[PDB]
Amino acid sequence: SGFRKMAFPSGKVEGCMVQVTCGTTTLNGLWLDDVVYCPRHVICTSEDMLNPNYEDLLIRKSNHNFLVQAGNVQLRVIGHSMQNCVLKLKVDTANPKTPKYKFVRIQPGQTFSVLACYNGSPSGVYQCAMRPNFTIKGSFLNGSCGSVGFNIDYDCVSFCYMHHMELPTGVHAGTDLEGNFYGPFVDRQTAQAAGTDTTITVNVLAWLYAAVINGDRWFLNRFTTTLNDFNLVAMKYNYEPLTQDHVDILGPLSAQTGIAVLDMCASLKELLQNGMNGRTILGSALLEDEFTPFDVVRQCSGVTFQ
């Protein structure tokens, strides 16, 4: 028993991280088959970032202007193209450590593992949610761009995120592996607004279910409620509206605990209107929304990968 914020094992993605240098700009790339993927602002000087014309900046760059390094070994670049905000560098050598992989664009409120990397080398792994406002709350120092987000299913790595930037508020923005930003963000050094950071209601309920499973059920009250009455309270607390799709998704957690989804909603409502009175839930003093129902299930059934 016990319940923890848990990353996927990182081995399969470790084997894919390289360093990419163009001029005197360095960041991380992802090497899959005979293609290296990296943030296109590898071609920018600090001065360029204020108002870049990526198409014009790219014209001045040839294959040999891109230095891709995998350990002590230099990869030969035989082709380059921009796809949205990512650069694709074709190399003469397929990555021999290429795992089975997919590129997936995730939904607001889904979770993924980040392998934070510096100079093509892994520093650490942590679990993030794509926030409703399409930011993530990561740990990213200078050089961390091109670090990727992923999920694993048995032997298949689903890549969903590449890190491109920090907003003046110190949350994080980036792209899928087709180079499309999550949210309205652009790869330019101008002032950008995230929008209201709403809570992932379905994830909070999943996490309450996790607690009950782990004997932490002090917050269970005597009441029930209705979807519309719950949501009226949700909106007031910047909680995402709960829908029947979300109720459906919590079904297995409902089934296991014998606690109906709407009874848990009434517990949640009471927690919002009364706070925690200095108590904790799974060792937290606030409501956690970075666990999905799938996450909770996966943990409590001990799903494995290889």
Q: How far is CA 155 from CA 9, 13, 30, 126, 158, in A?
A: 11, 12, 18, 20, 10
Lookup: tokens for 207:
């996490």
Lookup: tokens for 141:
């120092």
Nearest Cα to Cα of residue 162 among 290, 32, 47, 288? 32
Domain 1-14+100-197 matches domain 198-301 at the CATH topology level? no
| Polymer length of the chain | 306
By what technique were these coordinates determined? X-ray
- At 146, give phi and psi (nearest 5°): 95, -15
Indicate which residue of 22, 38, 41, 265 is catalytic.
41
Lookup: tokens for 107:
């939904």
Per-domain residue ranges for the chain? 1-14+100-197, 15-99, 198-301
Please name the fold of domain 198-301.
main proteinase (3clpro) structure, domain 3 (1.10.1840)
Residue 121 amino acid letter: S
Residue ranges with strand state E in 33-107: 35-39, 66-70, 73-75, 77-83, 86-91, 100-103
* Residue owning tokens 């999943």: 206
CATH number of 15-99: 2.40.10.10
The CATH homologous superfamily for domain 1-14+100-197 is: Trypsin-like serine proteases (2.40.10.10)
160 is an active site residue: no
Q: How far is CA 50 from CA 66, 135, 182, 228, in A?
A: 22, 21, 21, 46
Distance between CA atoms of residues 91 and 119, nearest Å: 19
| Sign for the pseudo-dihedral over CA of 68, 70, 76, 79 | negative
145 is an active site residue: yes
Indicate which residue of 22, 145, 160, 265 is catalytic.
145
Could you give the 3-state DSSP secondary structure of residue 37?
Answer: strand
Distance between CA atoms of residues 102 and 157, nearest Å: 6
